[PDB]
Amino acid sequence: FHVNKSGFPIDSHTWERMWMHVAKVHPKGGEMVGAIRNAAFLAKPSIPQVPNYRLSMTIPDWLQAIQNYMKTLQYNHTGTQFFEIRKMRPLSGLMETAKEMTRESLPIKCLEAVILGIYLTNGQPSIERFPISFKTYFSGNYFHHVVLGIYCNGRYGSLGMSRRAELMDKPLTFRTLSDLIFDFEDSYKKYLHTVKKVKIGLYVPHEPHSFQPIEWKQLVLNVSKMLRADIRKELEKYARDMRMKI
């Protein structure tokens, strides 16, 4: 769980640390690292075009293009996160980082994907965006994960990046926030994860104030302690509050 704080190109310390981590993690370790480092005939990966909304696109096709772009960047399995995300930084700063992601065009993980999905949907007021955070428990350890909730034309969905295909993008077909959250919980249970906490943020402003950050935890439910009827009750109340701009 290393983060690149050195910018681009990545500095020696960060670069050598990445290689040592994967050498430890991978069973062929040194042989694998030696095959890649200083290899003379590595494919230059193509650079995917950054998606941009045009009036000729349906909103679902546009969102799918955003999600496909993220998938083309790839989920970052290297162990070194390439773009530092300070979650409490103002949005203006986070959007500079998102632009840097489109310029440097490297693999990303879940938090970077949320920032990137905000950047790529900024300026389409029909799409409301809000972070959804999960704390899960699996075989004795806690895991944190976050996706970008989407609300558009009376439907909920999500954008994101995960190691698992069922914990990221969700189509605009959920009629309530509860249904969307319960679909994530059901997906998590396929991997024997118990959801401990669900955190819902506020809508992310399309035109935020200079110092406004993302709000990540406007609603926090300790769902492992609640009956599903109460979870739905609390999510639906909060979602109604969101939709009314209270």
Partner: peptide, 5 residues
């Protein structure tokens, strides 16, 4: 976040 999941 780190683990993402």
């Amino acid at each position: 976040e780190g683990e993402c999941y």
